[PDB]
Amino acid sequence: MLERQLGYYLIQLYIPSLLIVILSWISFWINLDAAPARVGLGITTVLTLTTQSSGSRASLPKVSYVKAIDIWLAVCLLFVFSALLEYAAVNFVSRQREFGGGGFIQRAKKIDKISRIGFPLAFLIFNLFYWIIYKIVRREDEFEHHHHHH
Template identity: 40%
Template sequence: MTDLILTYSVHLVLVLLLQIRVQADSSLDNSVKQLLSTSRYNKDRKPDSFSYVNVQVDIYDMAKTEAKNAEFTLELYLRMWWKDARLQYSNYSSLGNVSKLEIPEVNTAQIWQPDLYFLTDRKPEIHDRSIANRIIYIYRNGSIVYSERTSLTLRSSLDLTFYPYDQQMCLVELQSFAYTNDSLILNWHDSNPVKISGAKMAEYLISVGEYGHGDKPPLEQIGIYSTLRASIMLKRTGHAHFYQLYGPSFAVVFVSWLALFLDEKKVSPRLTVHTGCVIALTTQWIGIYFLLPAVSYIRAIDIWMITHLLLVVFAFLANILSLMARRDDRKNEIDKRKDSGGCEENFLKH
């Protein structure tokens, strides 16, 4: 009987706690709805006549690189901080113990947001599964934190002079689309506004270069826009190219010169080896050109391939010269035999 009473009491307490929790959540939802009600809050109007927005970019992955198109795709978190005094809730009794409100993605459209965009982004994309990956936090004093997960495809002005030991710079620029610097100013957040959190690739070492802010007038007749700039440095390691490029090309040159030590009588195998080496290097060079964009200057890899191709051609010419010299020696030997044979006949006649 005691166990039954105890079990009933526990169930009753759990039901009461659940009911209190449901009532609290319901009260919280009603307060949020009242806070964001269109009768008191206009999401299409800026909070103040002049606003500051702090921005942070956290890069967590480098999805892919396309050297042919000079494109690099980054996965990142974009975070923004601003203040909207209209969303203060310190006078709401139902929210007295709540330090911040979490606004899910389905309700973020009810809140005014800075219309930032990346000037250097070629394929803007917000990550979404069933809903987009974004969230907003509202604090008691009206401070707002916005966070979203997005992809950024940057185009770099590639300098392949020292390829495959080159270093590229990708410029990241953020700007408001509609608000000039008379009404909205962008600033980087804290002293470390651009972070790289675990973004790694086998071919590149990723680091943050210089960052700052300034003004950029895309349309001078409209106004000047506050702009944030940061550079992402991509340093190619070149280790993979040692096995895929340097090793094979060196082996081809070695084989081409090794063929010179074949028997001089085996003319056809020697020519076949040298011809095959020239074709192998040429094919490898063409493959490199398919991977890289066309440029008007000489790259380090071009000097490497030209040097090795010339070494193979020199080996081929050395083979030809040795065969010609051997043919001349045979001809001279035959002529000497003929001359010695003629002298013997004349001696016999006398």
């Protein structure tokens, strides 16, 4: 009868599950070709760590399933959507999307322009799951004491 009391174990378990995820991308900028083997393990570890995190079925994850489906129906399509954009952009270079193909062969230099979106992407998620976790427990923001601005 602890179906609704599962979120508690998902919160403390999400902390580490998210931290390891942020580092994954930090190493994806290189695994893009140098060693994509790690990228394939990290992406499968996140979906395998969550699916196995509810195998006991002793806490009645049923309820936590439906609710998790409303959120899982976008996080997986968006998480692999940004990864492919780059995993396919390398070859899309010929598209000349830029203002000139003068730096075509000079692209291997790796200006690390990929960390410009990932960096702010990890902080946004970490703060999106941290504020949402302490918010849901309130619903009407009774003890939120977070912003209180608006």
